[PDB]
Design a protein around this ligand. Structure first.
Ligand SMILES: *[C@@H]1O[C@H](CO)[C@@H](O)[C@H](O)[C@H]1NC(C)=O
Ligand code: NA
Lengths: 31, 30, 257
């Protein structure tokens, strides 16, 4: 039986050119 | 939420986006 | 998204980017269904064939986004997750049956011009809208092409992409693939003799397939980008988790937690 393949990145493409979220924004969400 | 599905920048302003007419047209012709 | 276009500002204010904290990576699309619940695909959180398993502390959601890559100051809002809920009968082993998950936010998000929840369909809305030939809309930041030689453009968009696609007859969906289709999915896209093209692709999974009700002006999430065989191939279609068919579980989770 063949296996359905999700439309999900498998080779790290989600990180391409991705800018970091600023630390003040990340810490605000964490509190 | 009784306000779901109504976009502030479109339905709430009585504005249509650039391609939604193709969706409504599919109800007529699709 | 293959054969789409740049979203207009605020065109899809329920679109959510599921984001990995470290390393900082786009993980999946998702959708905002209330001020504290987000809908996505189960395989975004749990996919054992690729050794994928994310829990609440690994991820965050970014809402109100347009740019794929920039942190959009004074526009996007980010939230941590309190709990993840994967459908108990999610079938990653074979056909991604019941490919759905819910995420509760740690803190409710405040709506804005760019942040607003989508509606979930009821029984008559699903019976009325989810019919072959009617078109819905898919949005995502995923790949613009399956392969590089398929067109001259870039691999990934700088901005959220949108495409409208027709729902396909169930016997055509079934005949299009050797994978066992279930009643918890539907497929959408054009047939070759319709000339037009378009599909969701790698990176779009978890995002919403939405339709606009011709009777009350509201947008309803009918589907979740799940799986396919390639992208925008002649004779193939993108497959979507059938949201209404799983709404009883959705309501159980939300009413209980
Ligand atoms: C997924 O990871 C969490 C912690 O990272 C762990 O507690 C859980 O058991 C894992 N799930 C599976 C199915 O391996
Ligand atoms: Na196709």
């Amino acid at each position: 039986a063949e296996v359905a393949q999700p439309k999900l990145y498998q080779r790290g493409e989600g990180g391409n050119g991705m800018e970091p979220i600023p630390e003040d924004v990340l810490n605000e969400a964490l509190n | 939420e009784a306000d779901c599905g109504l976009r502030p920048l479109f339905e709430k302003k009585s504005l249509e986006d650039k391609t939604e007419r193709e969706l409504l047209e599919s109800y007529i012709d699709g | 998204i293959v054969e789409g276009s740049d979203a207009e500002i605020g065109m899809s204010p329920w679109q959510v980017m599921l984001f990995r904290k470290s390393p900082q990576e786009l993980l999946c699309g998702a959708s905002l269904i209330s001020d504290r619940w987000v809908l996505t695909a189960a395989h975004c959180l749990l996919y054992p064939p690729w050794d994928k398993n994310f829990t609440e502390n690994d991820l965050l959601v970014r809402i109100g986004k347009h740019s794929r890559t920039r942190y959009e100051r004074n526009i996007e809002k980010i939230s941590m997750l309190e709990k993840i809920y994967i459908h108990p009968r999610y079938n990653w082993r074979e056909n991604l049956d019941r490919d759905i998950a819910l995420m509760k936010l740690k803190k409710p998000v405040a709506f804005s011009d760019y942040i607003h929840p989508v509606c979930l369909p009821d029984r008559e809305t699903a019976a009325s809208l989810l019919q072959a030939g009617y078109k819905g809309r898919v949005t995502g930041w995923g790949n613009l092409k399956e392969t590089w030689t398929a067109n001259v453009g870039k691999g990934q968009p700088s901005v959220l992409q949108v495409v409208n696609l027709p729902i396909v007859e169930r016997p055509v969906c079934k005949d299009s693939t050797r994978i066992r289709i279930t009643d918890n999915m539907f497929c959408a896209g054009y047939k070759p003799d319709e000339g037009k093209r378009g599909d969701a692709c790698e990176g779009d999974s978890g995002g919403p397939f939405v339709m606009k009700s011709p009777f009350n002006n509201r947008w309803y999430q009918m589907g979740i980008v799940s799986w396919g065989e390639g992208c925008d191939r002649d004779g193939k279609y993108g497959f979507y988790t059938h949201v209404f068919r799983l709404k009883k579980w959705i309501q159980k989770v939300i009413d209980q937690f």
